[PDB]
Design a protein around this nucleic acid. Structure first.
Lengths: 70, 147, 142, 24, 141, 261, 99, 54, 157, 48, 235, 165, 70, 58, 154, 41
RNA sequence: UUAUUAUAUUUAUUCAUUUAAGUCAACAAUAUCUAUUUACUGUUUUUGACAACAUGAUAAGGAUUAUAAAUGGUAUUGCAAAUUUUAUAAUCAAAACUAAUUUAUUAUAUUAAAUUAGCAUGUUUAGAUAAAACAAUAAAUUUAGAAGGUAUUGUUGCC
């Protein structure tokens, strides 16, 4: 666990990070195992990112505050 | 004018800059005598080994504070400072338990029932009498207090 | 401020319903000074230990000509209640005194003694606007 | 120990391997 | 800017309505204190409804058997002395240690203001209608 | 028409000189030639501005307890002062006088050099607190009102330039000034030994000769004035028996060039 | 040892900022590898054996790590003083570990 | 002490109202909501209630 | 004064001077007062040198002293007033409105950055920041990490 | 742009303008300042 | 440069310092969401690089080349030096003696608050280095009471060839039976004859009879100090 | 169970050895520390959010003492309080001053050496010029407000001001 | 949130039951998060401290060095 | 945890039921710590000197 | 059931729609699997629902099939009847899961939350230890303590 | 005073922008807010 | 409705806080060849940044220019650089709400230390209404491309 260490890794968003980490590992060990892996996407990396903190949104992620009209 | 900016400060300007400012005499760091365990840290009040940081550090100074507060203060004057419980000894209900632990320990014996008056119909306290006049307590100031 | 209730209205801005950090709300508004929780009557708004010494304002440091009012952090003692002399605490509009002394006041600081938000409001101090808002509230009905 | 050590201002202390500047 | 507009004067002679009101309120402060303090104390001397929730084990077991045995024999006089408040009994019951750790984990207990009902609180309407004159923080009765 | 904060003024030059010095022109400040500092004020108005500026303790404020205002206005209503008798009933007087303010010299390092625990900032240099005479801080005569005006008041006229000198004081300013202002070699040449501190020095030469060296040193730290030479003769004498060479030199380099040789 | 060569180099703040940056560096991390102490002594006794250094570590619990007694003297701000006071507390620790 | 027999301006203030709306803004009077539980409809109440199976 | 040849551009700019003395006065009175509160409420024996009466009599003496002291600074730092040296803007520290490092309010700091007068490196508004220490535990972590650097890494003696 | 002057020792827009260095350039030393060692002044203190 | 094996000195990187300074870019009173939603994060930063120089010996001529680097640094770049020099330290057992436990073991009662202030004379412990030869002691008899070697005693006091009773011998450094320089059991001064048959009746004659300070006499004798001169109210 | 921790004095054992408490004593003597008599045994709570690896913010040291009742009015706290001397607050005392150029030096000294005389701050200039331009063109707004009125309320023997038309 | 079956029931220390008047009723410390968060960190540490101290099958016993285990 | 001898001492509570029911305060008021009280809040982290957070004093 | 405080109901689809968030929470459908499994009851609707979600979760990323103009609209109609079927499949299962559990508590004697009906043991809504005077819907003033529907012994 | 050729000067006074180009990609993008904002290139 | 591509889409709602004035200038003390400089005194004529008017200046706010590393704007938001001509209003300890521009903690366990919140139990129930498409998981009930204005910074327009 190189990243931000957490008590329990029981979430797929971490599993894929492990599913990829094992995928890239096999390729370095075995050259022609990259063909069946790359065709199935286990090598490819997600660019998804949970929104960083921001004070403007009330919860801080994607829901803005309230505003009432007069 | 032609872009030749020195990647390195030339050796000349090194000597010219390095000779415009004087050596700190303390960074010489020579000591063949040793350390003076009895005297060095106790030097004169001007250049003294001045403690700094957490209050633990002020060993030789706290002693002076005590010796100082001992000096100017007459115990006579300090007597008048009352603790809270010293003051709460004059309250009708000076000490009764709070609900966290010993709620059940409280009893009607703790009630200053004679202070107020009860009405049987409402079962409550309708009013209270005057306690300043009739409170005759031999310790308005506490016993060991002697002005 | 919209309504400068004192000299410090012209300067500071409401900044909306800003959420200060806990216990760092800038104005020390002790509107909860007198909230009587009888079980915690000795621990609420008092010294967290009952072996502390009394605050400074209950004492006299030097030769004073005289204080107009003693501060509201002063704690009430029997000497306070028995000597009966005029003891004043600052409050709006001018000052409050403890004319009718009692021993139920002995031991509690003057914060817990006075009522900060006096229930009787001033139809005189509030313009026709700010009074109207009380009319809708039902605090100052019509 | 002069200010400009002998490494610089000297023929015999010349670093033959030290490549000139406009080469690299 | 809503340029800060002045509030008018405090009104003529309201100060007298102040020194008066604050004072005789602080006098009322005594009786509500004297009333609620008694209510708190005399609450502490009374009996409460049993703090446990009979629905959950090990308090579903019939009064004859189960932890009611030790409740009836080993500590019976004690649980009456502590007046069945939900703070001491759960501490007294934990001391006997003959039921293990099943005080907190297994045994579920009544909510707070459901456990301050005094004994003989039959009607459930009661637990919400405790008097309003007293200022106690819902320890009173 | 003509308005000012002050009507009357007093000079800052002596009489016997001004009759003659008035001829040489004074190259005043170009933009504001009329120079009106604190020194030029009369000691009547001097006190009034001295009172305020301190948010709480300043006698200027009515609730400072030291104020001279007998009856004051609080939101259109008046309020009367409580004289000291009617006050001393409830709040028990705990007063120790000025000598409670002056924290000893060994504790300057603890309290950022300051011995005087007044509301203001008493500075051992003259220029910060100069009213008219070079500010010499007094220790025994410290009073709430601070008569000599030797404190860095907050909000008096001509305070900016005075405070900006404070925040620019050296690392040792209250420290070195207090040592340099007093405790300087005698004009005739000798060293100013004698103070009422001499019994302390006798104790050391009573204590050092016995061989209780560390007892001398851990007591010698309390010494403030310049020690006379008979002190060190006894001190370094105690370093001889145990070859505590590191200590004698540390004693030397202290009395050598740091305590006027 | 940190002197300033920036806007804090010359004018009236030359002192107090210099004083700060030194009282902020008053530490002098006294260190010594315990295995070094396992030498003979001028009395002829072995200085520090397994029975002694065992007492040493437990005398300074968090201090003696990675087999090197680490004593950081932060009492005084005169750095030379921290050397003297530091070495002072140092020998005392060996004075007892030799028991 | 000796609580004055008639209080000058304690009760002589303006009356205070008691909230009479069982919910937001103190306006929602009692009425059968959508959350009503029809126990008759089927072996489970409709709508179903939050059920956790620990 | 009373606006007679006022030299500064804004009158409230002066209050910064007073506030700076508070930190100076706090440096003056802290060690002495803090020592009192350190001796005031100790109920256990002070030391085997002082137990019983020499303690409880002195305990009142030491507190009486800090009570005898005149105008002593008893203000906790958070109760002071955060004001800018530039525009005398009042700031509520701990909020977004008070920039912590340069110690200037938002209004003064916002202006200074756009009308560039201070060297800051912009970072994406949504981001946690280019830093790697702040990322891991949020605002509280960096708060912890410095205490480790300032005081805790020092294996005391 | 106001009465409060710009601190020339801490402002980038000034320090990184064209009338001074930019943060990109080789950033070496401009000119050695031999003042105290070419025309030195003697020590005439005010404090005796 | 970043590899020690190939380069000397070898620069060691170090994580830059970053301090996020978020603030409201807007400025208005009526609306708070306006403020919060207008947050913008500008950061201060400082990048460090650590030069690690290892000299197999400590040359002060080199160090003063180092502390002169602060002058000619590239613009807007301050530096700090971490010197780490071996230093020889004497653990002289004469000052710090590795002696047995105290018979009365100190306890937690000696480690309350302010114990450092009132319970412990700052180490090292003071020890008497000066000892007076008693009426008929010999060189072996003095070496006895000082628990030292007579030969070491003979070497210690060079000037002392013959012992004359009443002169103080300089205790050897290697001594094992040196005394704590004070007495523990309290002593009292009776108004028994002292100076002639007349007793002590004033503060100064009080000092003259003990031969110690009036001050230090007042310090222990507190009750007698608060009343009178030599506590004029006799018994 | 609540017990009485035993201290078998090392002498009266079969094979003597310095008990661990003795070391804990001998330590506190060397590094002057405070051994609390009333320390609780049950309260060995370690700061888990910091001194454990699996947690995000592992700092290895115990950052906060998990004693909730911990305050600054406490005695033990103040023993370990950090004096504000020479900290952030000192720097903010001397660097965060209204006119940041004044911390460097007194301005008059600067305008004495660099300039020839003291010059007023840029504000007074804008105050001064604008008075002149209006006073050169217009009048009737000139309120002769001075610090000290003596110079005006009593002009000297000479100085008959030219009648300004 | 403070559903009393959370945090092993110890959430009952932080719960203002019923239609509270947000202005006058409801303790302050129950509102701010970090105090709520610091508190849970206390209790959550206890379970570890409890479990670490429930597995104390061994009892610590000092012993002079000579006859300790090898 | 080496505890003072002769003092009636308490073993940490092994069963949870003992842990909750004992009277333990919860941290109502503001949090304070001797070291980082200077660094007033988690948000405002005062730095008297900006140094790399991994600056190890030699 | 350790949860007994008052509750809030949401319609079936409004929960079914959450899919793998709560409705098809992997471990949840594993819970009601074992419970079904152990009771000797076939887990046919669950495994019927399980494949529905597993395909939807697997294909939640792709685009919808290209909407080419079809005047017949059979594809859009088939796109609807196959959907409303899937909803009706989960509708049955959603109710089925609530059917057994409340009945299951009839066999373990666990008092369900407020306003909850167990077919035989609590015919109408059970409510004990609520925040109000009366049964919230039947306007019957509660009995104190919370009434019990099972027999006391285990 | 060193120099290297210019590409576009951008006088962004508060009045307006006047953006001249002699196109290249870039190098250091100078900046001056003495009185009139200008972006040298 | 013109021949590389999706809105129908949950998760929310009772929220307030500010005090009792004070700027008309600068001054080494130790160890470098001596200055009492020790205690360096000379008497007093103005009215902007303010409690008041006094030009500039950076924000909030989504709607039609990424397939091999980017989802927050300029017209302007209190304290800012040329308009002055009643006036001290600034944080200091202990202190009083009327305020549009706000996550408050909802029933196994609940106040430890700078002073910190007791009445609002009533079917997570009126009408109004709030905010997501970003390391997550919803990819379609469907889109450029033809159109008018009495207004003339333009529908909150004018008539």
């Amino acid at each position: 666990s190189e990243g931000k260490a957490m008590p329990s890794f029981a979430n797929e968003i971490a599993a894929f990070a492990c599913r990829m980490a094992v995928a890239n590992a096999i390729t370095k060990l075995l050259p022609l195992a990259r063909i069946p892996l790359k065709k199935a996407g286990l090598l490819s990396v997600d660019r998804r990112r949970e929104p960083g903190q921001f004070p403007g949104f009330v919860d801080g992620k994607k829901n803005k505050r309230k505003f009432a009209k007069r | 004018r032609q872009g030749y900016l020195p990647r390195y400060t030339p050796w000349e300007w090194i000597a010219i800059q390095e000779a415009d400012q004087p050596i700190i005499h303390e960074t010489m760091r020579t000591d063949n005598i040793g350390a003076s365990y009895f005297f060095s840290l106790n030097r004169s009040w001007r250049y003294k080994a001045r403690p700094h940081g957490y209050l633990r550090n002020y060993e030789n100074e706290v002693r002076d504070m005590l010796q100082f507060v001992d000096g100017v203060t007459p115990w006579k004057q300090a007597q008048k400072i009352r603790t809270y419980w010293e003051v709460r000894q004059h309250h009708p209900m000076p000490q009764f338990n709070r609900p966290e632990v010993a709620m059940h320990r409280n009893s009607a014996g703790l009630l200053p029932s004679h202070m107020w008056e009860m009405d049987k119909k409402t079962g409550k306290v309708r009013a209270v009498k005057d306690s300043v006049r009739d409170y005759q307590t031999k310790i308005p100031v506490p016993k060991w207090v002697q002005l | 401020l919209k309504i400068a209730k004192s000299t410090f209205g012209f300067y500071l801005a409401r900044r909306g319903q800003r959420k200060f950090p806990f216990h760092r709300r800038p104005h020390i508004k002790n509107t909860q000074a007198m909230n009587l929780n009888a079980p915690y009557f000795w621990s609420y708004m008092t010294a967290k230990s009952q072996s502390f010494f009394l605050p400074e304002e209950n004492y006299i440091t030097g030769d004073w000509t005289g204080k107009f009012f003693v501060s509201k952090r002063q704690v009430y003692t029997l000497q306070h209640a028995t000597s009966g002399g005029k003891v004043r605490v600052k409050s709006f509009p001018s000052v409050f005194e403890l004319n009718s002394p009692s021993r139920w006041n002995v031991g509690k600081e003057m914060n817990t003694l006075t009522k900060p938000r006096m229930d009787l409001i001033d139809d005189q101090m509030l313009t026709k606007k700010q009074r109207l808002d009380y009319v809708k509230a039902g605090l100052l009905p019509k | 120990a002069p200010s400009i050590p002998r490494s610089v201002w000297d023929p015999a202390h010349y670093n033959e391997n030290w490549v000139d500047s406009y080469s690299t | 800017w809503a340029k800060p507009k002045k509030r008018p004067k405090v009104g003529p002679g309201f100060h007298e309505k102040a020194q008066k009101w604050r004072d005789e309120y602080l006098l009322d402060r005594h009786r509500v204190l004297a009333d609620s303090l008694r209510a708190y104390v005399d609450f502490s001397s009374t009996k409460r409804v049993e703090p446990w929730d009979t629905r959950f084990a090990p308090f579903d077991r019939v009064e004859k058997d189960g932890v009611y045995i030790l409740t009836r024999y080993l500590m019976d006089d004690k649980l009456q002395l502590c007046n069945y408040h939900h703070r001491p009994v759960k501490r007294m019951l934990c001391n006997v240690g003959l039921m293990g750790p099943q005080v907190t984990t297994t045994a579920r207990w009544k909510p707070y203001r459901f456990a301050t009902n005094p004994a003989n609180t039959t009607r459930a309407e009661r637990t919400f209608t405790k008097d309003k004159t007293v200022f106690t923080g819902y320890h009173h009765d | 028409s003509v308005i000012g904060v002050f009507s009357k003024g007093r000079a800052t030059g002596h009489a016997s000189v001004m009759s003659v010095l008035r001829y040489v022109p004074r190259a005043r400040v170009p933009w504001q030639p009329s120079r009106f500092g604190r020194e030029n004020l009369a000691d009547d108005d001097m006190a009034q501005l001295w009172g305020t500026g301190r948010y709480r303790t300043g006698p200027g404020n009515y609730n400072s307890g030291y104020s001279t205002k007998k009856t004051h206005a609080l939101e259109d209503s008046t309020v009367s002062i409580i004289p000291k008798h009617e006050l001393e009933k409830f709040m028990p007087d705990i007063s120790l006088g000025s000598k409670a303010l002056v924290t000893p010299v060994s504790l300057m390092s603890a309290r950022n050099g300051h011995r005087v625990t007044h509301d203001l900032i008493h500075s051992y240099d003259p220029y910060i607190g100069r009213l008219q005479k070079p500010a010499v801080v007094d220790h025994d005569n410290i009073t709430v009102e601070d008569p000599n005006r030797v404190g860095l008041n907050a909000a008096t006229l001509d305070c900016r330039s005075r405070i900006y000198r404070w925040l620019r004081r050296g690392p040792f300013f209250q420290e070195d000034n207090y040592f340099r202002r007093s405790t300087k070699l005698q004009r005739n040449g000798p060293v100013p030994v004698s103070v009422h501190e001499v019994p302390l020095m006798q104790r050391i030469i009573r204590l050092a000769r016995r061989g209780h060296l560390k007892a001398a040193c851990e007591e010698y730290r309390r010494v403030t004035s310049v020690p006379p030479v008979d002190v060190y003769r006894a001190l370094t004498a105690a370093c001889v028996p145990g070859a505590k060479l590191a200590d004698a030199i540390a004693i030397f380099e202290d009395g050598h060039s740091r305590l006027f040789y | 040892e940190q002197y300033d060569n920036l806007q804090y180099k010359r004018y009236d703040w030359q002192g107090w900022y210099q004083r700060m940056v030194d009282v902020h560096n008053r530490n002098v991390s006294i260190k010594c590898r315990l295995d070094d102490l396992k030498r003979l002594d001028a009395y002829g006794n072995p200085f520090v054996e397994m029975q002694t250094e065992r007492r040493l570590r437990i005398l300074a619990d968090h201090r003696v790590g990675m087999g090197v007694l680490k004593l950081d003297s932060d009492k005084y701000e005169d750095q030379h003083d921290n050397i003297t006071y530091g070495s002072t507390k140092l020998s005392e620790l060996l004075a007892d570990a030799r028991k | 002490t000796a609580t004055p027999e008639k209080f000058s301006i304690l009760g002589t203030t303006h009356p205070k109202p008691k909230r009479n709306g069982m919910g937001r803004n103190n306006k929602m009077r009692s009425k059968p909501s959508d959350n009503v539980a029809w126990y008759d409809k089927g072996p489970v109440e409709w709508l179903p209630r939050p059920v956790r199976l620990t | 004064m009373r606006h007679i040849g006022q030299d500064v551009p804004r009158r409230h700019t002066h209050f910064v001077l007073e506030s700076r003395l508070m930190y100076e006065k706090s440096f003056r009175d802290e060690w002495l007062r803090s020592l009192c509160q350190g001796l005031a409420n100790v109920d256990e024996p002070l030391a085997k040198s002082l137990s019983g009466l020499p303690q409880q009599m002195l305990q009142r003496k030491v507190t009486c002293f800090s009570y005898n002291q005149f105008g002593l600074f008893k203000v906790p730092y958070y109760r002071l007033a955060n004001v800018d040296r530039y525009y005398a803007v009042q700031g509520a520290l701990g909020t977004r409105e008070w920039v912590p490092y340069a110690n200037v309010s938002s209004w003064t700091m916002n202006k200074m950055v756009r009308s560039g007068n201070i060297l800051v490196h912009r970072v994406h508004y949504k981001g946690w920041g280019t830093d790697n220490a702040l990322n891991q535990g949020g605002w509280e972590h960096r708060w912890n990490k410095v205490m480790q650097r300032n005081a805790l890494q020092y294996n005391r003696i | 742009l106001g009465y409060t002057p710009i601190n020339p020792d801490t402002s980038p827009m000034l320090m990184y303008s064209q009338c001074h260095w930019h943060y990109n350039l080789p950033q070496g030393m401009e000119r050695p300042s031999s003042v105290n060692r070419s025309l030195p002044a003697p020590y005439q203190p005010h404090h005796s | 440069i970043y590899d020690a094996n190939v380069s000397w000195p070898h620069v060691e990187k170090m994580e830059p310092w970053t301090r996020m300074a978020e603030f409201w870019t807007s400025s208005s009173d009526t609306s708070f969401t306006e403020l919060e939603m207008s947050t913008a994060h500008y950061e201060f930063r400082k990048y460090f690089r650590v030069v690690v120089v290892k000299m197999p010996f400590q040359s002060t001529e080199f160090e003063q080349r180092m502390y002169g680097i602060r002058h000619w640094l590239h613009r807007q770049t301050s530096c700090e030096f971490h010197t780490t020099y071996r230093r020889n330290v004497v653990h002289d057992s004469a000052v710090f003696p590795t002696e047995h436990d105290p018979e009365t073991k100190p306890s937690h009662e000696h480690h309350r608050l302010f114990s450092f202030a009132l319970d412990w004379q700052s180490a090292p412990v003071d020890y008497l280095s000066v000892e007076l030869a008693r009426e008929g002691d010999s060189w072996s008899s003095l070496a006895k009471r000082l628990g030292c070697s007579e030969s070491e005693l003979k070497a210690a006091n060079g000037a002392m060839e013959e012992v004359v009773a009443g002169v103080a011998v300089s205790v050897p450094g290697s001594a094992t039976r040196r005394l704590t320089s004070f007495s523990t059991t309290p002593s009292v001064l009776p108004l028994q004859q002292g100076d002639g048959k007349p007793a002590i009746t004033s503060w100064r004659r009080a000092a003259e009879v003990l031969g110690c300070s009036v001050e230090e006499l007042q310090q222990a004798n507190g009750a007698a100090a608060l009343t009178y001169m030599a506590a004029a109210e006799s018994g | 169970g609540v017990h009485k921790v035993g201290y078998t004095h090392p002498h009266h054992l079969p094979v003597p050895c310095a008990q661990r408490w003795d070391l804990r004593l001998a330590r506190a003597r060397i590094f002057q520390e405070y051994i609390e008599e009333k320390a609780p045994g049950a309260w060995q709570l370690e700061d888990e959010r910091h001194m454990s690896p699996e947690f995000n913010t592992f700092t290895g040291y115990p950052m906060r003492n998990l004693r909730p009742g911990y305050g600054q009015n406490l005695p033990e706290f103040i023993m370990k309080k950090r004096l504000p001397n020479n900290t952030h607050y000192e720097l903010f005392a001397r660097r965060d001053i209204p006119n940041e150029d004044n911390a460097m030096y007194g301005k008059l000294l600067y305008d004495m050496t660099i300039h020839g005389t003291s010059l007023p701050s840029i504000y007074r200039m804008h105050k001064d010029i604008n008075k002149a331009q209006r006073n050169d063109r217009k009048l009737s707004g000139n309120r002769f407000k001075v610090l000290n009125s003596s110079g005006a309320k009593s002009p000297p023997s000479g100085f008959e001001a030219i009648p300004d038309a | 949130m403070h559903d009393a079956n959370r945090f092993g029931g110890r959430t009952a220390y932080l719960r203002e039951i019923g239609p509270i008047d947000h202005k006058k009723k409801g303790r302050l410390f129950k509102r701010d998060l970090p105090t709520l968060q610091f508190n849970v960190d206390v209790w959550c540490a206890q379970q570890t401290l409890r479990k670490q101290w429930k597995g104390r099958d061994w009892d610590v016993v000092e012993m002079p060095f000579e006859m300790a285990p090898k | 945890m080496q505890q003072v001898p002769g003092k009636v001492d308490q073993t940490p509570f092994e069963e949870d039921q003992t842990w909750l029911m004992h009277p333990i305060p919860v941290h109502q008021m503001q949090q304070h710590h001797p070291e980082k009280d200077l660094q007033d809040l988690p948000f405002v982290n005062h730095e008297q000197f900006p140094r790399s957070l991994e600056w190890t004093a030699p | 059931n350790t949860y007994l405080t008052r509750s809030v109901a949401t319609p079936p689809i409004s929960v079914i729609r959450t899919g793998p968030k709560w409705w098809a929470e992997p471990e949840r459908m594993v819970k009601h699997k074992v419970m079904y499994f152990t009771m000797g009851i076939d887990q046919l609707p669950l495994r019927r629902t399980a494949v529905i979600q597993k395909d939807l979760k697997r294909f939640h990323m792709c685009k919808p099939p290209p909407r080419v103009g079809d005047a017949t609209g059979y594809k859009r109609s088939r796109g609807a009847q196959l959907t409303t079927w899937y909803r009706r499949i989960q509708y049955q299962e959603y109710h089925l899961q609530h059917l057994f559990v409340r009945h299951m508590w009839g066999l373990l004697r666990m008092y369900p939350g407020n306003t909850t009906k167990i077919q035989g043991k609590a015919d109408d809504g059970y409510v004990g230890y609520d925040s109000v005077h009366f049964h919230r819907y039947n306007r019957s003033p509660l009995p104190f303590p919370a009434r019990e529907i099972y027999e006391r012994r285990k | 005073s060193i120099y290297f050729n210019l590409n576009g000067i951008l006088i962004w006074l508060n009045v307006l922008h006047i953006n001249i180009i002699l196109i290249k990609y870039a190098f250091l993008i100078l900046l001056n807010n003495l009185e009139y904002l200008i972006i040298f290139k």
